[PDB]
Amino acid sequence: MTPESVMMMGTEAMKVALALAAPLLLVALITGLIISILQAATQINEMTLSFIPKIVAVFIAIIVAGPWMLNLLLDYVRTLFSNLPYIIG
Amino acid sequence: VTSEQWLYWLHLYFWPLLRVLALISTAPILSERAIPKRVKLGLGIMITLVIAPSLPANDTPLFSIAALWLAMQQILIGIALGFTMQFAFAAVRTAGEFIGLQMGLSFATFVDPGSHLNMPVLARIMDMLAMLLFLTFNGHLWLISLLVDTFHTLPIGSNPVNSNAFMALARAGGLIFLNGLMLALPVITLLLTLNLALGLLNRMAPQLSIFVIGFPLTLTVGIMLMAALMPLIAPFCEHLFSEIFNLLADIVS
Amino acid sequence: AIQGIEGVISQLQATAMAAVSFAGQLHAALDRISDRQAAARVQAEKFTLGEPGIALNDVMADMQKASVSMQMGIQVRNKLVAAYQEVMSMQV
Amino acid sequence: SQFSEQVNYQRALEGELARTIETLGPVKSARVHLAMPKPSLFVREQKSPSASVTVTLEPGRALDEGQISAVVHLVSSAVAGLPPGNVTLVDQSGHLLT
Amino acid sequence: ISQFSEQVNYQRALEGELARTIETLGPVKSARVHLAMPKPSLFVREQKSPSASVTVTLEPGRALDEGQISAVVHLVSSAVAGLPPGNVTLVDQSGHLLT
Amino acid sequence: SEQVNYQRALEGELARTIETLGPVKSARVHLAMPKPSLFVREQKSPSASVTVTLEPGRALDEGQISAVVHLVSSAVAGLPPGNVTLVDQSGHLLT
Amino acid sequence: SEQVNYQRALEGELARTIETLGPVKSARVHLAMPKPSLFVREQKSPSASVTVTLEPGRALDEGQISAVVHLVSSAVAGLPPGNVTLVDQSGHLLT
Amino acid sequence: VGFELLDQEKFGISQFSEQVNYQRALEGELARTIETLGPVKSARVHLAMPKPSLFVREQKSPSASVTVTLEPGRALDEGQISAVVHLVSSAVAGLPPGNVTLVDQSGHLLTQ
Amino acid sequence: VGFELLDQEKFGISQFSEQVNYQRALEGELARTIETLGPVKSARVHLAMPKPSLFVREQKSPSASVTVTLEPGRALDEGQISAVVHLVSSAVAGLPPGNVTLVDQSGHLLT
Amino acid sequence: VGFELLDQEKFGISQFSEQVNYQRALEGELARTIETLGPVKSARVHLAMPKPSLFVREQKSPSASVTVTLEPGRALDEGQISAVVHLVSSAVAGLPPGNVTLVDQSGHLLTQ
Amino acid sequence: SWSLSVQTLVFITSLTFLPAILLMMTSFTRIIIVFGLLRNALGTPSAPPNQVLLGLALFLTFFIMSPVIDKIYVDAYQPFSEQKISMQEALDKGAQPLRAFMLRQTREADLALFARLANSGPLQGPEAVPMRILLPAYVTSELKTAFQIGFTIFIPFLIIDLVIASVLMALGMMMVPPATIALPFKLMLFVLVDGWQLLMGSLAQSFYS
Secondary structure (H helix, E strand, O other): OOHHHHHHHHHHHHHHHHHHHHHHHHHHHHHHHHHHHHHHHHOOOOOOOOHHHHHHHHHHHHHHHHHHHHHHHHHHHHHHHHHHHHOOO | OOOOOHHHHHHHHHHHHHHHHHHHOOOOOOOOOOOOHHHHHHHHHHHHHHHHHHOOOOOOOOOOHHHHHHHHHHHHHHHHHHHHHHHHHHHHHHHHHHHHHHOOOOOHHHHOOOOOOOOOHHHHHHHHHHHHHHHHOOHHHHHHHHHHHHHHHOOOOOOOOOOHHHHHHHHOHHHHHHHHHHHHHHHHHHHHHHHHHHHHHHOOOOOOOOOOOHHHHHHHHHHHHHHHHHHHHHHHHHHHHHHHHHHHHHHHO | OHHHHHHHHHHHHHHHHHOOOHHHHHHHHHHHHHHHHHHHHHHHHHHHHOOOOOOHHHHHHHHHHHHHHHHHHHHHHHHHHHHHHHHHOOOO | OHHHHHHHHHHHHHHHHHHHHHHOOOEEEEEEEEEOOOOOOOOOOOOOOEEEEEEEEOOOOOOOHHHHHHHHHHHHHHOOOOOHHHEEEEOOOOOEOO | OOHHHHHHHHHHHHHHHHHHHHHHOOOEEEEEEEEEOOOOOOOOOOOOOOEEEEEEEEOOOOOOOHHHHHHHHHHHHHHOOOOOHHHEEEEOOOOOEOO | OHHHHHHHHHHHHHHHHHHOOOOEEEEEEEEEOOOOOOOOOOOOOOEEEEEEEEOOOOOOOHHHHHHHHHHHHHHOOOOOHHHEEEEOOOOOEOO | OHHHHHHHHHHHHHHHHHHHOOOEEEEEEEEEOOOOOOOOOOOOOOEEEEEEEEOOOOOOOHHHHHHHHHHHHHHOOOOOHHHEEEEOOOOOEOO | OOHHHHOOOOOOOOHHHHHHHHHHHHHHHHHHHHHHOOOEEEEEEEEEOOOOOOOOOOOOOOEEEEEEEEOOOOOOOHHHHHHHHHHHHHHOOOOOHHHEEEEOOOOOEOOO | OOOHHHOOOOOOOOHHHHHHHHHHHHHHHHHHHHHHOOOEEEEEEEEEOOOOOOOOOOOOOOEEEEEEEEOOOOOOOHHHHHHHHHHHHHHOOOOOHHHEEEEOOOOOEOO | OHHHHOOOOOOOOOHHHHHHHHHHHHHHHHHHHHHHOOOEEEEEEEEEOOOOOOOHHHOOOOEEEEEEEEOOOOOOOHHHHHHHHHHHHHHOOOOOHHHEEEEOOOOOEOOO | OOOHHHHHHHHHHHHHHHHHHHHHOOOHHHHHHHHHHHHHHHOOOOOOOHHHHHHHHHHHHHHHOHHHHHHHHHHHHHHHHOOOOOHHHHHHHHHHHHHHHHHHOOOHHHHHHHHHHOOOOOOOOHHHOOHHHHHHHHHHHHHHHHHHHHHHHHHHHHHHHHHHHHHHHHOOOOOOOHHHHHHHHHHHHHHHOOHHHHHHHHHHHHHOO
């Protein structure tokens, strides 16, 4: 009820969002950086060949860590809906 | 006996109802479409039932241009109060949308302005957070109390009016921008530095950077930055509400 | 209640320091109409009883007046309900 | 911030007023404190602003009744809607001159 | 600088300047002013009047005149929007209430 | 946090001025600033506890007790003097 | 976390001042602050437990017990003195 | 460890983790004060914070179990038992004394 | 066997894990204190904390099984059986003593 | 197995897996304690933890099967059999003792 | 007591205000606001059709207001039907349990505000509050509680859209709308975590707590 509780609500929610999005974004960033440094080493420059492995890497990311995200988000929503009638004002 | 003078009761219960309902239809949270219309009408009716008997009853007939002037006055007062209150949420929405646009979340606006493709999701997040904070600080009760109080300052009866006062509400349009800049400032600046950092990377081997490495990094950095910046809005939320409230108190009179 | 009497003395102190409504009017009108109807009915039953002094003229006239008062109450209720329905139909 | 701007304006006015008060012959140094009224989140009410002026006089340089008057006028005029009667003038010994 | 911070800083600055002027007063060697500015709430009618506490240290034997106490009262009250004099307390270095 | 910090800073300054009183060697001020309740019959109000350490034998005058009360009460928005407790280093209630 | 930290800081400072009191060698304060409610009925009063260790033979006077009570009660928003328990190093309730 | 465990500067997996840490710290400090007392050589405090139902407005209350190890032959006074009870009850929001159990190193119940 | 024992397990821990770990930690500490009781050489505590169900008109309560190994010939006193019961019951939110079973190393029910 | 089994947990763990692992661990620890009782050389516990529903007509309470191997000639006492029953029943949320079966290495039912 | 004609007239007239009682004196407002907000959250403004949600809200209100209705029937309707309590006293007797139910769920701040707006004297206990003060205080408290519940409801459905947009933006697909991708995932979430049982139970507890 108190504004401290509200702002905590937003923080924990958006940290959950950060945890959900961090693996995919970080995998894409690492793949892009690796392809870019390889291009710099080989002196190859086409703006389209960096887009190819990124999709494959990010799609594999759901294969490997997808169940973890799905279990984390469901637990968050379940706990939020269960604690809903105790943060009422 | 068995009089029950109806015109007296109607004139006593009408104009306060007009002002209360005019505030209701525009005041934030009390004007959200999710409330059924009958609930809003009943709240206005009950508030008027509580308030009106204490006020001096007016005797101007409903079939006169004076009644039209009175109705216009009540509508103006109600919409002015509600809109001045709404300005703070407008400012919060502006700050959130700008943080989100510096995230690169909606890049299609820079190339196709107003092209039916825009999602200010951060703006919505902080808008609903601001609504929750406003609910916590009981701002709506204050709004109702000030709606009641503006009578003593400005009675139902037609009273003369001023000018630059309207400018004040219009000049409040500056606040939406001015306060929005500060909220952002605590994050956009660092994001700016990040973009500057990306520039240093592009000053190296040409191409092979930006649109491939900049976007995910800046998205994650914006996310964690403003996630850490979330505790900061609440003092600024109270500052915004106080600014709107004392501006209203000073200018309505 | 003991606390209720405490509240009464508190309101008396409030009056000391300091030194009807539409629903009330409707309740008063209903009570008046019902009292008139009950008076007419009681006089009619007294006449039917055979008790001396009650004239058929007065019985019939009082029944007439009670019927008129009932019809007045019905019309007032009808309008009042119509006005309430009109107000609740307003779009906000 | 606007509030910061308002504080700065209040301080500057105080400074200039003290300055002119000192420049006056009998006055060696002046100190002006302004209380501008405030807004409320509810209820109408003006609070005619108020001023407190402390003067230090030159050895034995007592201020004339006319002098108190002129100090009063200047301070009142320099503050939008300052009712003279809300200006207090005091000496270095704590005597109320107004 | 937060909106709250901005206010607290304003309060501190006012306290400082008031103490300053009080000290400049001949008999006063040092002054200390504490302001309590109150809070508006949606559960009360007349907001509580602000209050002030003033501690003075006098020069050896420099007792303050009744008028000296009065003038101090006036200055402190005026410097605080809506400060009712009766809510200004003046105390010496020995703990004697001068007001 | 902003509020709690305000509380700590105020407590500190009040203790400071109290020590700056001839007979007082050190002061400790505790403030209880809470939220009130309307129509709860007898609610309550903000409260203060002041502990003073005196100089060897420097007993505080009744006036001294009164001036401490006034200062602490004024420094706290809406502090009713009667809710200020003053105690010495031996545990004697001076108020 | 912010609240729990505030509670442990208040406990610390209170123990600190209590130890300052001459006869007291060390103090330990435990606060039980309950859940607040903004409805029209739900309300509960907080409680405190204070353990003091005295200097060899330094028995606390009645007035002393009274002053400890006052200080602890004031430092906790809405703490009814009667909910402050004071105990010595031997387990005697000075309350 | 008590508050020290909280001061290890370790990420709180979740509110639940924070709550567990708080419970542990309170237990630690309470045991600490209980030992400090003369006759007590070591103390162990276990707290059970309760949980609400689903649609039942009927409510319950927390419980505590305190195990003390005494110094050779240092039997606790009735008043002592009473003071331990008071301290533990006060340290737990809404702890009804009657839900505090005090036991010695031999398994004798010192309370009721 | 240790509060801090499960205070790690990296992350990616479905809350289910968080609860199970708490249960294990509580079991460990309870066994620990029970061992501290003089006559007790080692203790083993098993908790059955029911996961709430909205199927029964009212909520069910948990249960505990306590196995103690005594020092050679160190028989537990009735009052001792009572104190073990109290401690275990209190340590479990809403544990009705009557649902605490205490058994010795030979399989004698002390409860 | 048992508590140690739930250590090297790969991120990919379905709730189903979580539960099954919890069941395994409980089985392991229970068998362990049952071996601790003197006469028992090895124990094997099987738990059947199922769905609850609500229709009183068809309710299937949790069930357990316990197989014990005794030391040469170490027959279990009636009281012992009772204590095994109590322990297993308590360790399983809502396990009605009457649904615990205890059997020896020769196939004699020790319970009922 | 009133004549039978007057009693029939009053009964028929009072039968009119049933929607007003349902909306302004009953648990209907919070449930309907929460349902509207949730429908706004999932991105399907016409999904459960208004009639389906209205029927569900009516059944929920009937299940929630059951003890209040039972108390009214046992204390007011039963004596009135047995000619023990007059028609003008059954209303007063039955308005008390509803008043108590409205009070418990209301808030101090609203009560204080509407006690001040009426210029009424001090209300030392809740037993001095009339209906003219409790009605709008209860209405405002219900509106605020419903909006709080809905606004904490809204957060996960916006979190999903945020992460969807960020993931789409990592790969450079800046011209893909995020709402169209997020809607199936929001539906999947609301399917997985017992979208309705948890919400139903949370609302029911929110009343009985």
